[model samples]
Target: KGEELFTGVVPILVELDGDVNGHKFSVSGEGEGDATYGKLTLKFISTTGKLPVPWPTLVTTLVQCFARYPDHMKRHDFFKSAMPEGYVQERTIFFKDDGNYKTRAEVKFEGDTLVNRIELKGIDFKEDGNILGHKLEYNGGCEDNVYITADKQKNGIKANFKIRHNIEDGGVQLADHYQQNTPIGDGPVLLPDNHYLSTCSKLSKDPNEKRDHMVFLEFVTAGITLGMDELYK
Candidate 1:
């Protein structure tokens, strides 16, 4: 058994549903009272005239947006009108230092549905307060392996991105040459400053190294998404 770093509970906000450019997206809370769990979903209701962005880009973008929603609720007063006290953008991370590290976040994809889920607990700000709890799944056509991380400071307001191809395909580092630290800005979080596809096309190699890299990387990123956030609007 592992020692508990911290534990508590936070208010899970209701779903924020939106439809733009032939796509439907929503952020919602679940579990008892619908205020203990979180979920982010993005689906293309219609194939015609989509957002024009690639599947991977849209998926990651929505993920970033979902992670920062609580922060937005905390910063903006508009949400207070409906629910006083606004929201809280704090989360706790559970860590185990037995050589192998792990957290409570799950990431996977299915069909054409992109989803992100989490459980709310504690009050520490880890991974820019963008701790993803339950599950994140993106069932799209992208061979690249997506990885996320937090800034150097534990309580930072920024997150970093590092992506690469599959190991069997010579595993090439894509995001390394691109943006390094992607901060949570007032506006949307778009991948790669250029916003262009095929930006990182330099073929490379690595597998076991890649696996180990992802292992430690996911451990931290995973541990980083154990807690949840308080909702307002």
Candidate 2:
């Protein structure tokens, strides 16, 4: 069962500049120690948000949320008639830790609605500097509560909620809803529901390094919020 696997990643210093809503941002990351440190750094040029909370990590994730996305899934998820320019990116990064995957993220474009999916997982509502791993948060502040749709043993991480987070502005609406009962944990005693702020997202960490040894479950699907509803919808 041991076979050579093909791999590719941004081995060092990846930077990007983009705009969300109407704000322009400049994000970049580089290694110091090993030069091979392999951490992508990010910076927000204007708007002034990088000084409040974990703005540095926040900037990095935002740019990555749209940058590290796959083309195929993006095409599939988006509505042809509603195509975008800067594009409404949607993706899902599977997580719950305590499982085969430690940190992983999925990205897409013009995704979907309905949280009939694994609403939790990579939703890292974490503020502050807890940004070394992968996480997605879409806390636009909802007025509705979501419900799960998959059987516990059936869909596994693919299982999620049954509502849509059609709120105004908080972060970004990646998926629709969410879940949090006994996600896969580490070392037996469990690990505190895998952090905070499950924002309808899951981002794969592919920096100039190995995502801090993060295997990332290695499955990229520019797919996302869209997945919340499945094709049957």
Name the runs in model 2 displaced over 4 angstroms. Answer: 1-10, 32-233
Q: lDDT (0-100) at residue 15 of candidate 2?
A: 33
Which pairs clash inside model 1? 108-137, 109-138, 117-134, 118-133, 118-134, 120-228, 121-228
Model 2 scores a C-alpha lDDT of: 0.24
TM-score of each: 0.24, 0.21
In candidate 2, what are the lDDT values of residues 1-233, reduced to their tens digit?
Answer: 00001012222232334333233444343321111121223212223334222222232133121122233322212211111111122223221221111112122112221001111122333332122222223222222222223223421222233322222333322332222222221112111111111222222444554222111111111212437657677
lDDT, model 1: 0.23
Alpha-carbon deviation at 145 in model 2, angstroms: 19
Q: How many steric clashes between backbone atoms does each model show?
A: 7, 27
TM-score: model 2 vs. ground truth: 0.21
Candidate 2 displacement at residue 54 in angstroms: 5.5
Quantify all predictions' global Cα lDDT against the true fold: 0.23, 0.24
As a whole number from 0 to 100, the lDDT of residue 120 in candidate 1 is 24
